[PDB]
Structure formats: C-alpha cells, structure tokens
C-alpha cells in the first residue's frame with residue numbers, strides 16, 4: 001500500500017516512502033560491510049551501476065536495515081542516471097522482481113524527478129551529485145537523449161581538488177578519513193564567486209574572505225581563495241586537467257541540441273538539483289553566464305530551491321504517490337509475461 | 348486527455364507531502 005522511493009546515488013542512497021517530504025534513510029552507497037556499517041567500494045560509479053552484487057547488498061540494506069520493510073509488500077520506484085544503458089535497466093528490473101519479489105516497480109530518470117519536484121514537466125535540469133553531473137533537457141517528462149550532456153566532474157572531484165590545493169600549501173590530505181575531513185570543509189566553507197578574477201583579487205587584498213577550520217589533531221587551518229577556487233572547477237574544468245567545457249557551456253550546448261521551438265521554455269526553466277549545486281552563489285553565477293551566452297532578449301530563470309540536495313528523491317515521492325501514476329507501475333504479472341525488457345515499454 | 352497527460356497535469360498541480 002505505501003510505495004517505496006529509492007534514489008541510488010554514486011555517493012548517497014536516499015530512500016523512503018512515497019508521499020513523505022524527505023527520505024527517511026540517507027546513507028553512503030558503499031560496501032566494506034554495508035552503508036553506515038573488506039577498503040571501501042562504491043558500486044555506483046559516476047551514476048551507473050558497476051557492481052551488481054554489491055548493489056544488491058545496498059538494496060537489501062535499504063529495505064531490511066534502513067526502512068524496515070519487506071520489498072515484496074510495496075511498489076518500488078527506483079531512480080537511474082540519464083543515458084543509463086538499456087542492459088542496466090533490464091538488470092535492475094530483473095533483480096527487483098526475481099530477487100526482491102516486488103509487486104510492482106518503476107524506474108525514473110533522476111533529473112526528470114527533480115524537474116517534477118519543482119512543479120514542472122518541461123525544462124532543463126543541471127543535476128550535480130557526488131560522481132556525475134548532467135544537463136538534461138526535458139519535454140513533457142521525456143528526457144531528450146540526443147541533447148543530454150554528461151560530465152564526470154562532481155562533488156567527489158571537487159573534494160579531491162580541494163585536498164590537492166590544500167596539500168600544496170603543506171596541509172596533507174590523502175587518506176580516506178582525510179578525504180572526509182576535506183568534504184566537510186568544502187560543504188561548510190566553499191562558495192561560487194560571481195566573478196572569479198575579481199574574487200581572486202579580494203582574497204589577496206584583505207583577510208575578509210577568510211575562514212578557519214579546526215582539524216582532528218587540533219591544528220586550525222585557514223582558507224581563503226580556496227573557498228571559491230574549489231567549485232570554480234565546475235565552470236573551469238581545466239583546473240583538474242579536464243578538457244570539457246564548464247557547466248554553463250554545457251547547459252548552452254544542451255539547449256542548442258534541442259529544437260529552437262522549445263528553447264524559450266528551457267531558458268526560462270533551468271532547475272538545479274543535487275548536493276553539488278548547494279554552493280552559495282552558484283545560481284547567480286549560472287544566471288550570469290547563461291545570460292552572456294543566450295540571445296539578447298531571452299528570458300533566463302534559474303530555479304535552485306533550498307531543498308535541492310534531495311529534490312530527485314522528493315520528485316520520486318510525489319510521482320509514486322499520485323493517483324494518476326497508479327496505472328504506470330510495471331506489475332509483477334507484466335514482468336512474468338514480458339520479462340526484463342518490459343522496462344523499456346513502461347519507463 | 349490521455350492517462351499520461353492527466354499525470355503531467357497532476358505533477359504541475361503539485362501536492363502536500365507528509366512531514367517525517
């Protein structure tokens with residue numbers, strides 16, 4: 001009777017019950033033992049499932065340990081990355097019906113669900129999490145595959161670059177535990193500058209931008225320009241030696257792969273989602289950059305609401321609890337008759 | 348309106364979610 005919603009991130013699983021405002025379970029997508037509880041291994045790399053046995057351990061941990069449910073008792077909506085291979089969609093569907101014996105399931109694209117969380121069915125999303133970033137233009141709930149852009153530069157890369165630019169100050173962050181310390185520094189202290197060159201000058205001219213952080217050994221480190229240099233990587237991927245254009249350009253390129261007839265609607269409905277869009281200033285920087293690239297009279301709107309770390313999950317919670325959605329589930333009966341490729345007909 | 352079109356309309360309407 002209650003549907004389950006599971007957004008399986010490269011870094012975090014967000015899971016809970018359709019109709020709720022927030023996931024009840026948020027835990028790391030890792031096995032040594034599983035989740036909150038061998039190395040670590042992350043079974044989702046850059047948003048795509050790469051270790052199916054460990055993915056099954058994460059799904060079992062979600063149902064039994066975290067949610068305290070039997071998956072055979074609930075319709076289950078799962079999420080997937082944009083451009084998820086057809087074979088991966090079929091493998092998830094099979095696991096759910098044959099291993100977990102779900103009565104019904106659905107798989108939705110992450111970025112589509114965050115568009116839905118904003119009350120829209122057409123728009124373009126920038127979804128940036130821990131392992132992957134995408135630009136995803138959507139027309140009436142359809143993600144347009146020829147126009148989707150993927151960038152393997154997201155939160156984990158930003159933490160690794162902040163580690164590198166601090167290390168090059170003499171503060172050495174290299175280990176797994178040290179990486180977690182720097183991820184916390186990044187979340188607490190980083191921001192996106194409106195004008196990177198200007199901010200570089202302010203940093204150097206004043207201590208006004210400085211913040212201090214106490215490390216575990218009671219060393220206190222001070223960071224200045226590292227606060228904005230770290231996420232500036234999203235706009236200048238050359239900072240970590242990537243040749244890709246930054247995320248304002250890839251937004252543009254994505255728009256330009258779509259018909260000119262929908263472009264007004266994409267520019268006026270640019271939704272940001274995922275943990276790596278949380279930086280103070282990132283919406284305003286995007287609005288500035290996309291205004292520079294768009295036609296001169298074009299209306300630009302960036303929608304970056306404060307709940308955006310979980311908007312994929314929230315859109316799933318809305319979707320799976322709508323009365324108009326109840327005929328859209330793949331039922332176990334349909335899976336028994338059609339097998340795993342039913343997922344392509346229905347999702 | 349197709350069932351898909353009613354679904355898109357419901358998504359645009361939005362809804363209240365339960366506080367956890």
Ligand SMILES: Nc1ncnc2c1ncn2[C@@H]1O[C@H](COP(=O)(O)OP(=O)(O)OP(=O)(O)O)[C@@H](O)[C@H]1O
Nearest residue numbers: 009010011012129130131132155187274275276278
């Ligand atoms: N306030 C914050 N500022 C900057 N980064 C943040 C903030 N909060 C979380 N993040 C980063 O967001 C990432 C977690 O985001 P999220 O849960 O959206 O990713 P995911 O869905 O697991 O990954 P993906 O969709 O890439 O597979 C981590 O890199 C985390 O450090």
Ligand SMILES: C/C1=C/C(=O)O[C@@H]2C[C@@H](CC[C@H](C)/C=C\CC1)O[C@@](O)([C@@H]1CSC(=O)N1)C2
Nearest residue numbers: 011012028029030130155156157159179180183
């Ligand atoms: C609080 C928290 C946040 C997070 O995003 O966690 C996810 C999951 C995590 C798994 C490793 C870890 C030590 C476990 C839990 C930390 C989970 O790795 C990340 O922290 C990584 C390594 S540093 C980074 O930015 N992403 C992202």
Ligand SMILES: [Ca+2]
Nearest residue numbers: 009110129274
């Ligand atoms: Ca995600």
